[PDB]
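Hi both,

Apologies for the delay on this - the queue was longer than expected. I finally got the 3R-hydroxydecanoyl-coenzyme A-bound model through. Below you'll find the protein sequence and the ligand SMILES exactly as submitted, and right after that the structure tokens for the full complex including the ligand.
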Amino acid sequence: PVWRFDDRDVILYNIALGATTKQLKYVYENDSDFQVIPTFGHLITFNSGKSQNSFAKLLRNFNPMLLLHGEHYLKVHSWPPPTEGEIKTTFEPIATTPKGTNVVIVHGSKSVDNKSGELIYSNEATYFIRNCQADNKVYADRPAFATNQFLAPKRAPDYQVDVPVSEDLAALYRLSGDRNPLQIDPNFAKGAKFPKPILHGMCTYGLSAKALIDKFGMFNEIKARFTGIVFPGETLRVLAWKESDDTIVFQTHVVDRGTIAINNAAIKLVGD
Amino acid sequence: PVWRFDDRDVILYNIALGATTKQLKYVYENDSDFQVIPTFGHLITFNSGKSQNSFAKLLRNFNPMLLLHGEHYLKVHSWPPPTEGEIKTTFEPIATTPKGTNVVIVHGSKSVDNKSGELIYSNEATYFIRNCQADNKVYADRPAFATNQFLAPKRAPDYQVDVPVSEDLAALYRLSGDRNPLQIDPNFAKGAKFPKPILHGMCTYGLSAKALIDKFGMFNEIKARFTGIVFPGETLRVLAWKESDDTIVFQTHVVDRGTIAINNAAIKLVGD
Ligand SMILES: CCCCCCC[C@@H](O)CC(=O)SCCNC(=O)CCNC(=O)[C@H](O)C(C)(C)COP(=O)(O)OP(=O)(O)OC[C@H]1O[C@@H](n2cnc3c(N)ncnc32)[C@H](O)[C@@H]1OP(=O)(O)O
Ligand SMILES: CCCCCCC[C@@H](O)CC(=O)SCCNC(=O)CCNC(=O)[C@H](O)C(C)(C)COP(=O)(O)OP(=O)(O)OC[C@H]1O[C@@H](n2cnc3c(N)ncnc32)[C@H](O)[C@@H]1OP(=O)(O)O
């Protein structure tokens, strides 16, 4: 379950989240401040091989076509996140909860340096799966940040910014590891009850992450709920509330349809 | 000297050349017509290890910073080009010719399938190197197509298309293998007497090739002279003439400055 990556991966990922040559630190591997947007650490989800599917042991009548990314939580334990090297990931179940004819499963992971043993990333993916069953069980504990609902305060955001999503971004973003046909193949997306392919939840998430970093700087911790779908070609609106010296609460909206794509979300800033 | 590549490399390359999700044949690995734009075969130039620099052994006063891609010839011998596998490449010098304080050097290569021995690609790369010296020598015979002038006919073009070059295109394109700082680092480009980083010769070429394919179909042989620089953010204009059942002659102009970027160029269409 070893993920091998280098600056090519870093740059291909950063570019997909909107890094331009105005920011050589994200797109040029020899730049003095070369760095990867920390949501990159989620990619153990897709590049750890067969063991990454171990959540499915707990599901009855699982059709991957009907799976949606429901929430994601990511912690970077070792700062800054590496731009090259080797990471070994170990997976474990956290919880399964029936929601009507749906299931919500929480899949937990730890990602270490495969050379040294050093803890680098921790992830908790939550899937919302339609027409699926599972036992009502809790298996493991979670950090508070991961279950914080991070309700936006009832006041205007301290910061707001629009982020265009290219019609072709899913095709580029998916090269980072998530080959799900759902986001590229119209006939597959049609079988999952969408009128055309949708945008990877983790893409919206990274686009939001990137926008927040330009404004508030780097973070080592992130959690969010995917509350509504995004299509390639649409324009996102990232709303940000600075709730402490440390913590930025946010929402990502779809300008075009007036829905909320990301809710119950926050980042925790690395300090100085 | 083994290049390992797969659908990811293919799609990453296709996108940099302007392939969109309207063309799933170029950007989705499970499309039944999944295929790579054949200029992909030049990439042995960058993905074959240290032996690929062997041309420099014939050079005196060589500074890589002062190197420019001068001409390029590619033949595809095995149709269609593979979208995954392993290719072993071997290189030979073809010619060195001093032009005043410059050197023109031609670097020959054959790229086989590493498992089978099958000739996949052949390349002839011509570099124009400023402030360089070399002997006046001819080492090898060359195909007619590689040395053809392909004079643009006097009549009006049969076909004409504009191809906009994103200002960020260099940053994506170079992930296909060519890591030269000339195209990304403004400081290095300044050392080369360019007011901003230039676009990769092979990108202009691939962009041009892509546009030619959308109109004329697939080709298995291509040759072009790089006669003018291109800057990312500029608009290319491809000019084309059908000169036989086999052969399409072209040029690529830079609209913004009224220069000729690619001249003395043709493609050989794939048969029936
Ligand atoms: C190899 C590993 C593979 C793993 C990665 C897989 C590949 C990935 O590429 C997949 C993707 O990227 S898919 C795209 C990203 N996600 C989305 O777009 C989801 C957008 N949100 C929605 O369509 C709805 O919130 C929707 C449809 C999810 C739910 O909305 P509703 O149908 O209106 O459900 P609702 O009636 O609101 O809620 C029922 C109960 O579920 C809880 N809940 C709601 N949304 C949730 C969510 N997003 N995550 C977790 N739980 C959620 C509610 O609390 C409710 O519970 P309760 O009744 O106890 O209050
Ligand atoms: C393993 C790793 C290897 C890596 C390899 C490559 C890595 C890459 O990153 C490199 C790139 O992509 S660099 C960018 C691409 N190239 C360009 O943009 C060049 C555009 N062309 C020019 O600026 C000029 O034609 C220019 C500057 C090239 C020449 O024009 P001039 O200085 O005006 O010279 P001129 O008076 O026109 O001619 C002098 C003699 O040189 C010959 N010549 C001219 N252009 C040539 C060319 N493009 N190719 C070959 N020979 C050329 C002329 O024939 C003339 O010789 P003669 O008088 O005997 O005929």
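Main takeaway for now: Helices of chain A lie at 7-16, 24-27, 44-47, 144-147, 169-173, 186-191, 201-216.

I'll put the files on the shared drive as well.

H.
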